[PDB]
Amino acid sequence: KNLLLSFFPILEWLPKYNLKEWLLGDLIAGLTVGSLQIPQGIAFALLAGLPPIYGLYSSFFPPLIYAFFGTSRHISVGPFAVVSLLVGSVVERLVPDDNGTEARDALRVQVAFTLTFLAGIIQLALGLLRLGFLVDFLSEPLISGFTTGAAIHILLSQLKYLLGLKIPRHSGPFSVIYSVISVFHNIPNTNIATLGVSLLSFVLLLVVKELNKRFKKKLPVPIPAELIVVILATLISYYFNLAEKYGVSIVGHIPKGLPPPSVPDLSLFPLVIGDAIAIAIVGLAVSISVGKTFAKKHGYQIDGNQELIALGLMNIVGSFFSCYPATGSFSRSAVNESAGGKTQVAGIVAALVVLLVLLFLGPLFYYLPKAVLAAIIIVNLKGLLMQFKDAPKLWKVDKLDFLIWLVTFLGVVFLSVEIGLLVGVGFSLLTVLLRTQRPRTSVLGRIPGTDIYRDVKQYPEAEEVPGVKIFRIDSPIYFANSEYFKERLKRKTGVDPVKVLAARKKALKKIVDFHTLILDFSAVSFVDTVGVKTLKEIVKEYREIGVQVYLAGCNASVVEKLERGGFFDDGITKEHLFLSVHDAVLFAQARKALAEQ
Amino acid sequence: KNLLLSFFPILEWLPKYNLKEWLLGDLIAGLTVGSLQIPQGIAFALLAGLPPIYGLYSSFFPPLIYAFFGTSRHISVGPFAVVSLLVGSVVERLVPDDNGTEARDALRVQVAFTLTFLAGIIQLALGLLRLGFLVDFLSEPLISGFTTGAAIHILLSQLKYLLGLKIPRHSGPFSVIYSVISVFHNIPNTNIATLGVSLLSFVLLLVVKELNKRFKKKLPVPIPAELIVVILATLISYYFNLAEKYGVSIVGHIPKGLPPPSVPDLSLFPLVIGDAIAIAIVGLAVSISVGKTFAKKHGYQIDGNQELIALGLMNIVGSFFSCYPATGSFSRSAVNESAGGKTQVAGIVAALVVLLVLLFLGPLFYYLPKAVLAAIIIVNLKGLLMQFKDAPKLWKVDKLDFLIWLVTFLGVVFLSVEIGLLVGVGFSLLTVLLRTQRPRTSVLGRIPGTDIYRDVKQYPEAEEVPGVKIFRIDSPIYFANSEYFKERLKRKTGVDPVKVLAARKKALKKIVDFHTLILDFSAVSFVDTVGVKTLKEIVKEYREIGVQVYLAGCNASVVEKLERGGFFDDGITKEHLFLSVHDAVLFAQARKALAEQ
Ligand SMILES: CCCCCCCC/C=C/CCCCCCCC(=O)O[C@H](COC(=O)CCCCCCCCCCCCCCC)COP(=O)([O-])OCC[N+](C)(C)C
Ligand SMILES: CCCCCCCC/C=C/CCCCCCCC(=O)O[C@H](COC(=O)CCCCCCCCCCCCCCC)COP(=O)([O-])OCC[N+](C)(C)C
Ligand SMILES: CCCCCCCC/C=C/CCCCCCCC(=O)O[C@H](COC(=O)CCCCCCCCCCCCCCC)COP(=O)([O-])OCC[N+](C)(C)C
Ligand SMILES: CCCCCCCC/C=C/CCCCCCCC(=O)O[C@H](COC(=O)CCCCCCCCCCCCCCC)COP(=O)([O-])OCC[N+](C)(C)C
Ligand SMILES: CC(C)CCC[C@@H](C)[C@H]1CC[C@H]2[C@@H]3CC=C4C[C@@H](O)CC[C@]4(C)[C@H]3CC[C@]12C
Ligand SMILES: CC(C)CCC[C@@H](C)[C@H]1CC[C@H]2[C@@H]3CC=C4C[C@@H](O)CC[C@]4(C)[C@H]3CC[C@]12C
Ligand SMILES: CC(C)CCC[C@@H](C)[C@H]1CC[C@H]2[C@@H]3CC=C4C[C@@H](O)CC[C@]4(C)[C@H]3CC[C@]12C
Ligand SMILES: CC(C)CCC[C@@H](C)[C@H]1CC[C@H]2[C@@H]3CC=C4C[C@@H](O)CC[C@]4(C)[C@H]3CC[C@]12C
Ligand SMILES: [Cl-]
Ligand SMILES: [Cl-]
Structure with missing residues (x-):
């Protein structure tokens, strides 16, 4: 029936899939995006405080379950910067850094699974109750302001890894301020070999991106910059032995084997419910924004409610199978489209590339320095930082649209990221009353x-x-x-x-x-x-x-x-x-x- | 200049005051309202957790300072039920009930003064920045819902005093539920003499109110019911000696003398800032609602901003002079109007009646049982409870206006009173988007x-x-x-x-x-x-x-x-x-x- 085919879009769009002029394109796009997911997967997993394998799990499971229940055709779901930042905040707040390391990691990942589960359930709820019209009220200035603020936090967080300092910091009220002055205090404690591999990493990244952009194709697939940089860095740090000699921090042990089936212990439900609500709302906002943009540009329509059900089911299954909340991204989606993505076959393909790296390749990333991951995160933060080009535009046209952007941006930087979003959304709704309260x-x-x-x-x-x-x-x-x-x-x-x-x-x-x-x-x-x-x-x-x-x-x-x-x-x-x-x-x-x- | 006369309305309206056809009316109204303020003053002071003298201080100072800076002509400011309930919540939360009693009372009143100060400063701020248009956004359904909910809390609180049980309770999430089942558990521990003086009090109150309403005038001033009931109860409890024999709880020592000048210790600023913001907003909402109603009915206009400055100055001076946040009330204002109030001379008169009771009468209220105060509070709660007549009316006309009333009412009863108000105000603003989001x-x-x-x-x-x-x-x-x-x-x-x-x-x-x-x-x-x-x-x-x-x-x-x-x-x-x-x-x-x- 039409209900089962609308509740499983895969069963409707898969039979119609013409294997001649699409399959080649989707395989190219899938290989391109898999090559991009692996390094970022690991990176964003560090940014969320979890062990590095959780990025690979989150890059494997979510894209599959989305391909099954999902309505968008150009969205790529996975671990994205701002959701990673929110999860990180929760984990280090419920689990301070002080045998001991494995106990801490076990409690960390238990918190992560509870987060994923609750966020999935909220998204699923909103989708079943046909409340997917409330994602309309999340203004474009509100989300621009929000993601730009979060990119300031993410940039500051990865400065410490980039120099090699051992600074503790917070995401609480005004935390940015004393966090940057903490980095200005501890700059004489700079590891030099860490800074070296950081700058070497940035040099290789900008060379490969500019080169493969301007120079001749001679390639069905573009050059995966992040992947070859990760490969060169781990080889260098294994030969020259940076880890023990120069004291360069490295990625830990990456285990071989499929994810273990787990259960999110709901003993933590009243501690993490706030941050799970923020994670669910940010996930909906960014996933559906991306879906709508690419749908408009390619001449089709997505269902907001079915997207909430898809994203919800994705996060609940991931919660059981050792993942942390995934979401759509504009960067991966752009790459999946520019590579020649036509369907969610591209997502399935990418997930198969991550799968073979989970099974086989695995512990070759032992000698990968953390500074290369921090550099990858920074070059991918370009996107979100170039949204400061929106504050003048808004200023020129509508000062209330400008204020929504500013209040959310300042809310996020100079208070909490959850509080920033809440304040932004409030002010966003108030601006309708402010327009209508002294009519003409x-x-x-x-x-x-x-x-x-x-x-x-x-x-x-x-x-x-x-x-x-x-x-x-x-x-x-x-x-x-x-x-x-x-x-x-x-x-x-x-x-x-x-x-x-x-x-x-x-x-x-x-x-x-x-x-x-x-x-x-x-x-x-x-x-x-x-x-x-x-x-x-x-x-x-x-x-x-x-x-x-x-x-x-x-x-x-x-x-x-x-x-x-x-x-x-x-x-x-x-x-x-x-x-x-x-x-x-x-x-x-x-x-x-x-x-x- | 017009600025000084607009920043001190007293200096503009006082010279014009015609002493022949008004003075008699305002003196009648002032004596009527003073006679009503004394008992309720003490009662509402108990409901806020403070010692009983603070009601008298709050009934004396605020009406004066308001007469000076205030723009309304029929408002009576003083200690009102719902503000008293919010102050109480804060005090017992920062100061649990466990030499010891005087130490606890000293810290209690320090918290109370900090509350009054911060609330005054917020009201004053909003008034100076010409943000008094934001009191428009506090819908009439929102405030109906809110005050009705608060009247449910106030009614439950005064059940324990009314029987004579020693139940501890909270104002936290769902606290009403386990609070009423706490009263159902401890009903066999009912003091009988306490219940006696409670029911005697209610009998005397309903007799005097019905009698002086229906029967012949033979009086320029109506019969002060609460005052004569307080007088008869204290006489009975002193002769028959209820306090020591039957174990009936009484009002403590009421000291003679003017208030002492005090300083609100701002060591508590980050603990009480939330509840001070709720107190300021509830004060503005109810004071200005009353002012506007009586102004419309008597054919003049009040300035919202000057009202915020007046109320702010009132609470800051009160903060220094041993008071807790005062606000306008509809009950006193109705009484001040029905008695023949024309100006704020009536407020000055009432405050002189409270003044002579602060100086002379004073410790005659030692043997006053707490059950008589609880009964007075309940008979004055009539007003707020008769607002359940608004939920059908809203239902019949506009279902979103009905939902604002319901969400705020349920927010207040079945969560915190601060959280109830916040949720109500949010939903109130959302209903504008909900009306305009699928236009015609x-x-x-x-x-x-x-x-x-x-x-x-x-x-x-x-x-x-x-x-x-x-x-x-x-x-x-x-x-x-x-x-x-x-x-x-x-x-x-x-x-x-x-x-x-x-x-x-x-x-x-x-x-x-x-x-x-x-x-x-x-x-x-x-x-x-x-x-x-x-x-x-x-x-x-x-x-x-x-x-x-x-x-x-x-x-x-x-x-x-x-x-x-x-x-x-x-x-x-x-x-x-x-x-x-x-x-x-x-x-x-x-x-x-x-x-x-
Ligand atoms: C009772 C309950 C209360 C409880 C408390 C809660 C209180 C809640 C708060 C409410 C307060 C909000 C009230 C806003 C009133 C609306 C007026 C308005 O904005 O219209 C504009 C003026 O505004 C601007 O253009 C100003 C832009 C600059 C501001 C900061 C720049 C910093 C730069 C960077 C520095 C960084 C840091 C600096 C920042 C510190 C003019 O509008 P316009 O041109 O006519 O066109 C549109 C027409 N409308 C909209 C006006 C109709
Ligand atoms: C946990 C519970 C949370 C519950 C929250 C409840 C939900 C929140 C509800 C939100 C409703 C609206 C609040 C936002 C007010 C915007 C202010 C504004 O206009 O300023 C603007 C920029 O100024 C800024 O940079 C503002 C930065 C952030 C805004 C702070 C607001 C207070 C709340 C923070 C709480 C702190 C908590 C402390 C720690 C917990 C400029 O002002 P403007 O006047 O427009 O400028 C133009 C001039 N005219 C001509 C227009 C006049
Ligand atoms: C993405 C971010 C999200 C994060 C989460 C945040 C989510 C935020 C939440 C948002 C959810 C709110 C959505 C509301 C949708 C509007 C539809 C609406 O209300 O219009 C009405 C239907 O509504 C009613 O009439 C219902 C009334 C009864 C309800 C309870 C009764 C209990 C009785 C007592 C029992 C006590 C306890 C029981 C209660 C449990 C019909 O309207 P109408 O007749 O056509 O006339 C007006 C026209 N309009 C307005 C419709 C245009
Ligand atoms: C400290 C920080 C605080 C920050 C808060 C942020 C600011 C808050 C923002 C508020 C924005 C809007 C939220 C209010 C939602 C109204 C729900 C609704 O419509 O239900 C209605 C009544 O249901 C009720 O009785 C609702 C009772 C209260 C509402 C709870 C909402 C969640 C927040 C609580 C938080 C709990 C916290 C736990 C402890 C801390 C009926 O539903 P309906 O569907 O309309 O019915 C008609 C049916 N159709 C046809 C219309 C569909
Ligand atoms: C989309 C990609 C290819 C853009 C190019 C990436 C590389 C070559 C360049 C351009 C984008 C750049 C980053 C963008 C953002 C910032 C923030 C700024 O305050 C300091 C420099 C820093 C940290 C840049 C370092 C160098 C960088 C990584
Ligand atoms: C400092 C943080 C908060 C970032 C916010 C930047 C804001 C306040 C700044 C950035 C760039 C600025 C704009 C840059 C250029 C112009 C063109 C000029 O003809 C009018 C002013 C206008 C339109 C400016 C208005 C304010 C503006 C939008
Ligand atoms: C405005 C005044 C004069 C109204 C009359 C007051 C007296 C005589 C009457 C009518 C108002 C009454 C109270 C109004 C509210 C309630 C709530 C109800 O669930 C139980 C009875 C109780 C507690 C009433 C007790 C008796 C009462 C105090
Ligand atoms: C129980 C708590 C939450 C109090 C809320 C009461 C609400 C849910 C009840 C109280 C009285 C009710 C109204 C009483 C009378 C009528 C007239 C009838 O022809 C249509 C329904 C209507 C209009 C009812 C609608 C729902 C209503 C407003
Ligand atoms: Cl990204
Ligand atoms: Cl009252």
Whole structure:
């Protein structure tokens, strides 16, 4: 049935796969992306505090399970920088660095699996409850700001490995500040051989990237830069024996064999639930952003809810099979597309390359220095840092879009990354109220010899109709802007009906221009409860000083809510609702005439 | 100057005060409200965990300082139920109940003063920075929900005092649940004499309230119920000697003398900053709500910012002079108005009544049982509990207004009161995005023999113009709803321009109805950055399949932001902006004719 084929997209898109003009392309793309996943896999695993094999496990399992339940065709899932950074924060916070090393690593990976599990379950939940419309509310400025901030943290973290210092640091409030001054203090304790292999690594990386970009193809597959750099570095550090002689830190023992099946111990559920919620939201945001971009560019559509179910299932299975939360990335996805990726066959191919390295190659990466991994992370951070090109653009167009970007960026750098995201999302939602809370109110006049009405301050041509005052608000009337609307009505019509009633009563017990106000509700998108209360007030007041109030332009939903809210018994009838300002005006003049006689 | 008179309203409204038809009324109102403040002062002081004299200090100082800097004329400030409940939470959390008693009380009141100070400073800050428009965003359902929840907590807290049990409880997550089952467990440990004086207290209160309400005036001032009940109870508990014989808990020693000048020790600033922020926001919300209600009803206006400055100064001075955060209340304000309050002279009068009780009367309230105070609190909780009459009303009109009320109510009862308020405010802001995220899109037709255009599905009369497709969205085009807008455009116009371009290119390299789309932007309130990007996409796509796109109805601000965002160089010129759908249609038909030849 259509439900089972929509809950397993693989069973629908796989039979249709034409093996002649696609298979070659997807195999090229898969080999290119596998060659890129291995080094980064290990690197991002260090950045999350886990042992190095978890990167390989996270590069193997997730892409498979996604290929099965996933709707996007150009996304590459795996271990990505910012999710790695969040997992790292949690692990070293629940497990300080102080037999002992293996005990610490066992508790570390238990925390990692609990994180993966809870994040998977949250993503899966949101997907089943059809709440995948809430990923719309994660603004593009919000995620730009967020990922740029996180790239500042990731850059600072990998400075220490890059010199060879042994600085402890935090990800807590203002931690960046004392972390960089910690690095400025301990720069005389710089290992020189570590700095050497770091700069050698960067030189080899920039040579290979520039060379294979500008120079002639002579290759169906581009040159895997990170892989050959990792290979050359481990060979050098094994021959010249850097580890024991010069004291250069290396990657530990990488074990041979498939992942062991594990169980995330939920004893830690109340400690890590906060960071698991942050991991789930960041995963959704970046995975679905990428999917949507490539889908638009290649002329197809992804389902947000099925993407949440896919990503959720991916992380839960990974949780059992010794992984840490995977997510879509723009860098791998760009590489998977530019290589000639057409389907999730490319993901399956990449995962087979990581698989053969998990089984066979394995402990050849013993003598790999940690400085080469830190350099790889930095050259891949280019992407996220070039998003500072967005703060001027936003500035030029919309200052509230600029502020969302700035608040999230500063939130992330100069407080926690979880707190940064929370503050950013709040401010993001507030900016809608801030746009609608002082709307654009106008008094309309008729253009001479035409049956259209427009603003009198903006179109001096338009004349007010005698006896008839027409006022138009250009916004919803809800709790934020209802007091303002009533005030601006009483200011631009130049009548306060309660002051006028007070004057008239006072004069009569001691012994206005218009007879009809027409509210143009064409632009009133919606009303809430406070809006309806305010409208009842306005109509009752102007009834008391003897002024009929007509509504000209209400949409169906506003009339229905005014009807529910009891607008239609305090003097106003549904015979006072007109279709256009003109019809209201005509009826008003006609009533005035037939009531004169 | 006008600044000094606006920063001290007393210096402007006091000289004008006419001593003949007001002074008598304000003195009656002041005596009525002083008589009501004394008992409740003490009661609410117990509910906040402080010693009983702090209620009297908080009933004396704040009303004075408010009379000086305050803009409202019917508000009565003092110690109110919900602020008392928040202060209490903080105190017993930072100071558990375990010489010893006086040491604990000293640290308790130090915490209380720090709370008052920080809350005052936050209110003052918001007022100076002209951020008093943010008190608009605190919806009426949000505050109804919140105060009703808090009244459930306050009611449960005063059950234990009312029976005479010695149950410990919390205000933490789900604390209500195990707190009520704690009371159900310990009901066999009920003191009988305590329950006696509790029920005697309630009987005297309901007798005096009903009697002085229905029966003949024979009185310029109504009968102060709470005061005479406190007096009768202390006399009974002193003669019959309840305290030592039957073990009835009593109010401690109430000291004679003016408050001592104190200093809030800011060693506790990082412990109590959260709860001080909650106290400041709840104070603003309830004070300004009351001020606005009575101002509307009596035909004047209050300044939100000057109210924040007034309330801030009030709490800072109180902080120094041995008080805890005061706020406006609807109950006292109603009583101050119904008694014949005209100005803040009534507040000054009330504070003089509390003053003479601080100096002279004082330790006569030694033998006052705590059960009488708990009964007074419960009969004053009527107000807040009768707000359950709001959940049906909201339900009937607007389900999102109903959900704001429910989420805040449940947040407050079944989690923390601070967390309840935070969750409520979030959801409150989200409901604006939820209303605007799937707006009402339409395809418009011309009414026959009329130059107006309306929906074709809703008005079958209207016919589409040949060659011209008119589409109208009835919302802002921002990040929440921009993908939807593009989708609904491509669905209701029945053309996907990228699919059409693909078909045409494919056909040409192997070997639509309309020529003009008119976007009616009359109801587009605003655009953000993502909106402009989407609009550029739409225009570029329909340029590629050879369809001119005109904008008919953009307001000034949208055109300016489209101009900034670079909308006006990808094929569209400012010569494609029309004033009305009709003008666009005419121009489109004319261009088509003159281009045919
Ligand atoms: C009661 C509960 C309260 C509890 C507390 C909670 C309080 C919550 C907080 C709420 C406070 C937020 C209020 C914002 C009001 C909106 C006004 C607004 O922004 O419109 C813009 C002004 O803004 C700008 O353009 C400013 C940009 C510069 C700011 C920092 C630069 C630093 C550079 C780098 C230095 C780095 C570090 C420095 C930073 C420190 C002008 O807008 P516009 O041009 O007219 O166009 C758009 C139209 N609108 C939007 C205005 C309609
Ligand atoms: C664990 C529980 C967490 C619950 C959180 C609840 C959810 C959060 C809700 C968030 C709602 C909105 C809060 C964000 C306010 C933005 C401020 C702003 O406009 O400043 C802008 C940049 O300034 C910045 O750089 C801001 C940096 C971050 C913002 C801090 C806000 C306070 C919360 C931090 C909490 C600290 C906690 C301490 C440690 C725990 C510039 O100001 P501006 O005035 O717009 O400038 C233009 C001038 N005019 C003309 C417009 C006026
Ligand atoms: C990606 C990031 C995510 C991270 C996670 C964060 C997730 C954040 C969460 C977000 C989730 C919120 C989504 C809400 C969707 C809006 C739909 C909506 O409410 O419209 C209404 C349906 O709603 C109702 O009427 C329901 C009312 C009853 C509910 C409980 C009753 C209990 C009674 C007592 C029992 C007590 C206990 C029981 C309670 C347990 C229908 O609306 P309508 O009639 O058409 O009129 C208005 C029109 N609109 C508004 C619809 C346009
Ligand atoms: C200290 C740091 C704090 C930072 C917080 C950050 C800021 C918070 C941001 C708040 C943003 C929005 C969150 C509120 C979600 C409302 C849920 C909803 O719609 O349910 C409603 C009632 O259900 C209820 O009774 C809800 C009760 C409270 C809501 C809990 C939300 C999770 C946060 C709690 C945190 C727990 C923390 C644990 C302890 C610390 C009904 O659901 P519905 O689906 O609408 O029903 C109608 C059905 N359809 C048709 C509409 C579908
Ligand atoms: C996409 C890739 C190929 C870009 C080129 C990568 C190499 C050759 C170059 C360009 C990108 C560069 C990194 C980008 C980011 C930064 C941050 C900056 O504050 C210090 C230099 C540093 C750390 C750069 C070092 C050199 C670098 C790694
Ligand atoms: C310092 C951290 C917070 C990064 C934030 C950078 C912000 C504050 C800076 C970076 C570059 C800046 C822009 C650079 C260039 C111009 C062009 C000029 O004609 C108007 C100002 C404008 C548009 C600047 C506005 C502020 C800006 C966006
Ligand atoms: C405004 C005043 C005068 C109302 C009348 C007060 C007295 C006479 C009456 C009516 C209001 C009543 C209280 C209102 C609230 C509740 C909550 C309910 O679950 C149990 C009874 C209890 C605790 C009531 C006890 C009796 C009570 C105190
Ligand atoms: C139990 C706690 C959470 C209090 C919340 C009460 C809510 C869920 C209840 C209280 C009273 C109820 C209302 C009582 C009466 C009616 C009239 C009927 O024709 C339609 C339903 C309607 C409108 C009910 C809807 C739900 C309602 C508002
Ligand atoms: Cl990446
Ligand atoms: Cl009260």
